[PDB]
Each structure stands twice: as structure tokens, then as C-alpha cells.
Amino acid sequence: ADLGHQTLGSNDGWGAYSTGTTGGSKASSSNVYTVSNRNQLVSALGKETNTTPKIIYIKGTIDMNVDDNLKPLGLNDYKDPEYDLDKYLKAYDPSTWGKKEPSGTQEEARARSQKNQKARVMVDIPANTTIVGSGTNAKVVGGNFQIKSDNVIIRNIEFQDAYDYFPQWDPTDGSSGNWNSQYDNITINGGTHIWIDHCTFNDGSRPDSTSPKYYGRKYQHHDGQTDASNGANYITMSYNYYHDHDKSSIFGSSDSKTSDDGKLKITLHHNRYKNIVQRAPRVRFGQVHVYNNYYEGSTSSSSYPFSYAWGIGKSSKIYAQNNVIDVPGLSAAKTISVFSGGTALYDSGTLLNGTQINASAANGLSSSVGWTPSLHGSIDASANVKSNVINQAGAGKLN
Numbered sequence: 528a529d530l531g532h533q534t535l536g537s538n539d540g541w542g543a544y545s546t547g548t549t550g551g552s553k554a555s556s557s558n559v560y561t562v563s564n565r566n567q568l569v570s571a572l573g574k575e576t577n578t579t580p581k582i583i584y585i586k587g588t589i590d591m592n593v594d595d596n597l598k599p600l601g602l603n604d605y606k607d608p609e610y611d612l613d614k615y616l617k618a619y620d621p622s623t624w625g626k627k628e629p630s631g632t633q634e635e636a637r638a639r640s641q642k643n644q645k646a647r648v649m650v651d652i653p654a655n656t657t658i659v660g661s662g663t664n665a666k667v668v669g670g671n672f673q674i675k676s677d678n679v680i681i682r683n684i685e686f687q688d689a690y691d692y693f694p695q696w697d698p699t700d701g702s703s704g705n706w707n708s709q710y711d712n713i714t715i716n717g718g719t720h721i722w723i724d725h726c727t728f729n730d731g732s733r734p735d736s737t738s739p740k741y742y743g744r745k746y747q748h749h750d751g752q753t754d755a756s757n758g759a760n761y762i763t764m765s766y767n768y769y770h771d772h773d774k775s776s777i778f779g780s781s782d783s784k785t786s787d788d789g790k791l792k793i794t795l796h797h798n799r800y801k802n803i804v805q806r807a808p809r810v811r812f813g814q815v816h817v818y819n820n821y822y823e824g825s826t827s828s829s830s831y832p833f834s835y836a837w838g839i840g841k842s843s844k845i846y847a848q849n850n851v852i853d854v855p856g857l858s859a860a861k862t863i864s865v866f867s868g869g870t871a872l873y874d875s876g877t878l879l880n881g882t883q884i885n886a887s888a889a890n891g892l893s894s895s896v897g898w899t900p901s902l903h904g905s906i907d908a909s910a911n912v913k914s915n916v917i918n919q920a921g922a923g924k925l926n
């Protein structure tokens with residue numbers, strides 16, 4: 528079958544569970560679309576409830592920050608008339624506002640501004656849809672695909688720079704507050720039976736290094752790359768290339784979301800993470816199979832220095848096999864970050880700078896996560912992972 532008609536193999540990770548992931552492979556000829564701009568993409572997707580099987584080819588670059596005439600939209604185009612960053616900073620400075628959630632005029636005007644941009648950049652992917660890049664240079668720029676539906680395939684696309692002009696100040700986030708932006712490249716929000724394969728995710732021409740600090744905190748314009756929340760389940764992400772980005776992949780958005788227990792069943796394999804800071808992935812609750820991924824970076828780079836690969840969140844159940852981490856000078860323990868409620872990690876065959884290590888043991892965690900993956904393809908020997916992943920992962924690799 529051609530790329531648009533290809534489906535997830537029956538053993539290929541959690542996405543292959545039950546009815547599996549066939550996306551729009553059954554599309555009639557009338558439901559095969561080629562799109563080269565935001566209007567065409569919106570047209571092809573239709574309503575969030577459009578379950579008609581469909582195939583959508585992305586041709587060239589689709590900039591999502593554009594108007595109905597495909598004209599670029601910048602900050603001033605979205606900015607609410609009443610919003611002003613300097614006034615917002617004065618309004619909510621912890622020295623005069625304290626640590627309560629911002630509210631009142633400036634925060635209302637920021638929220639309106641954010642919603643104006645969201646209306647352009649975020650699109651819902653309806654059920655039974657396959658979206659694939661044409662050739663080797665298909666790009667989605669500024670966009671955030673949201674998947675709340677079942678049975679969706681996304682392949683062979685480079686997603687760049689899902690950038691929020693109006694990050695929200697959250698003074699209770701973390702120990703000193705944080706700025707939080709709204710857009711990921713792909714947000715799986717309750718979505719099920721999803722395959723993300725041979726895509727590239729990066730921050731385009733707007734790396735985080737150029738962002739100022741306000742209240743001593745990075746004014747963060749990006750969020751995640753491929754995130755999963757709200758009972759998302761049965762997902763495979765394979766052969767993707769994540770690069771030059773801070774928070775890559777968060778699975779399970781909250782310690783309070785206990786309904787995520789038994790869900791967030793995700794398989795990550797043969798992905799490449801290069802100059803990714805953290806969350807690769809950060810997991811709460813889920814049974815997440817992580818195998819044959821390649822992580823590379825430097826703790827001392829001026830842009831996107833490595834912090835950790837796996838985030839052991841509340842009740843997480845990561846089962847890791849044959850993954851390879853090249854971060855010169857890193858200790859075995861620092862390959863992961865352990866959060867409260869994070870007590871267990873299975874890892875086998877982990878290599879760090881060529882040395883066999885045991886990340887779980889190095890952090891004194893339980894060696895068992897209470898399950899063993901059964902749905903998976905062939906697991907490469909660790910010694911072959913770097914080469915296989917560098918050569919095969921990312922958009923533009925299928926010709």
C-alpha cells in the first residue's frame with residue numbers, strides 16, 4: 528500500500544491494541560485530499576465529528592499563523608486592544624500581587640489574545656484520518672494538531688515552532704512560578720488508537736535561548752511536542768525525530784487525574800531526541816513501553832542543555848528496553864528525574880555513553896512496574912540503536 532493507505536502493524540505497540548490503528552486507509556477516492564495551506568487543511572478535516580475515513584496529503588509548508596486569505600498574522604494581529612505586556616507584568620508582579628492566580632483586566636485581555644491565536648493555530652483531527660507528508664519537505668509551521676478522536680495516523684511531517692505569543696504567568700507552578708504556553712505540535716487529549724510515525728518536531732527559527740526572563744523565569748513560548756492527557760490510550764510513536772526543544776513529551780497532565788490510571792498506554796520506539804532538555808517522556812500513571820530510542824545532547828550547551836530523559840511521575844509504569852543515551856559526563860542516576868509518587872522503573876539494556884547501566888537501580892527505585900509489554904515488534908540490540916535511529920528516524924526518511 529502507499530504511504531497514505533498504510534496502517535499500523537498488528538504487533539506494533541499499544542496503538543495496535545483491539546481495533547488497532549488504520550486511520551483513513553479505507554477512504555474513498557472522494558475523501559483523498561492534497562492540501563498546501565491552512566484553508567485547504569481546515570476544509571479537508573471538516574468538523575471534529577467528521578468520522579468519514581479520509582486521507583490528507585500535506586504538500587509543502589503549511590503556516591498556521593495566517594488569515595482567511597493566507598496572509599501572515601503576527602503578535603499585533605492577535606493582541607487584544609487592552610492587553611499590554613508591560614501592564615500585565617506590573618499587574619501581576621509577585622511583590623504586589625502575591626502568588627494567587629492572575630485575574631482582572633490584564634489577565635482577561637491576555638486570555639482573549641491567546642484565544643484569537645488558538646482559533647488559527649489549533650485544529651482538531653477527527654476520527655479515521657490519515658495525514659501524511661508528501662515527499663521529504665512537508666511542514667506544519669506554528670500549528671497544534673489536537674486529537675480527541677479514535678483511529679488517527681500522522682506520518683512524514685516536520686512540525687516546527689508551535690509558538691504562543693501570550694504565555695500565562697502561573698506563580699504557583701513550580702517553586703518560583705512559571706510562564707506557561709498553550710501549544711504543542713500534537714496534543715492527544717482523550718485520543719485513542721493513534722500512530723505518530725516518521726515525523727520531526729523542533730522549534731523552527733525561534734529557539735528558547737532568545738526568550739527574556741520575567742520575575743526571574745523564562746518567558747516560555749513553547750509547550751510540548753507530542754503530549755498525551757485526559758485518558759488518551761493505545762498509542763504508538765515510532766521513528767520520530769525530536770530536536771532543539773525543552774519539554775518534549777508529557778503523558779498524564781496531573782497527579783490529581785487518577786482516572787488516567789489504566790490508560791496512557793503508549794509505546795515509544797526508535798525515536799531520536801537530540802538537544803531535548805527534559806520530558807522524554809515524563810509519565811504519570813501509564814504503562815509506557817520505551818524501547819530502542821536514542822537520546823543525545825550536552826549538559827553544557829548554551830541552547831537546550833540536557834536535564835533528563837525519563838521522568839518518573841506519580842504511579843508511572845515505564846518499561847524500558849535497549850535505549851541508548853549519549854550525554855558526555857552524565858551519571859547513570861541523572862539519566863532520569865524522579866517525582867513524588869514516582870516509585871518504580873523497569874529498565875534493561877540501557878547504555879549511557881556506551882556503558883551498560885541500570886537507571887532504575889541507580890535511583891533506588893523498584894525494578895518492577897507491575898506489567899510486561901506483550902504488543903511490540905522486534906527489539907534491536909542496544910549496540911545497534913544509535914545507527915538505526917540516526918539513519919531512520921524523522922520526516923523525509925521514507926523515499
Ligand SMILES: O=C(O)[C@H]1O[C@H](O[C@@H]2[C@H](O)[C@@H](O)[C@@H](O[C@@H]3[C@H](O)[C@@H](O)[C@@H](O)O[C@@H]3C(=O)O)O[C@@H]2C(=O)O)[C@H](O)[C@@H](O)[C@H]1O
Nearest residue numbers: 699700701702704705773774805806809833834838864866
Ligand atoms: O514536575 C515537573 O515536571 C516539573 O517540571 C518543570 O520543572 C523542571 C524541573 O522538574 C524542576 O526540578 C526545576 O529544575 C531546575 C533546573 O531546570 C534543573 O536543570 C535542575 O538544575 O534542577 C533545578 C531545580 O531543582 O529547581 O525546574 C525545571 C524547569 O524549570 O523546567 C516545571 O517547571 C515544574 O513546575 C514541574 O512541572
Ligand SMILES: [Ca+2]
Nearest residue numbers: 711750751754
Ligand atoms: Ca501540552
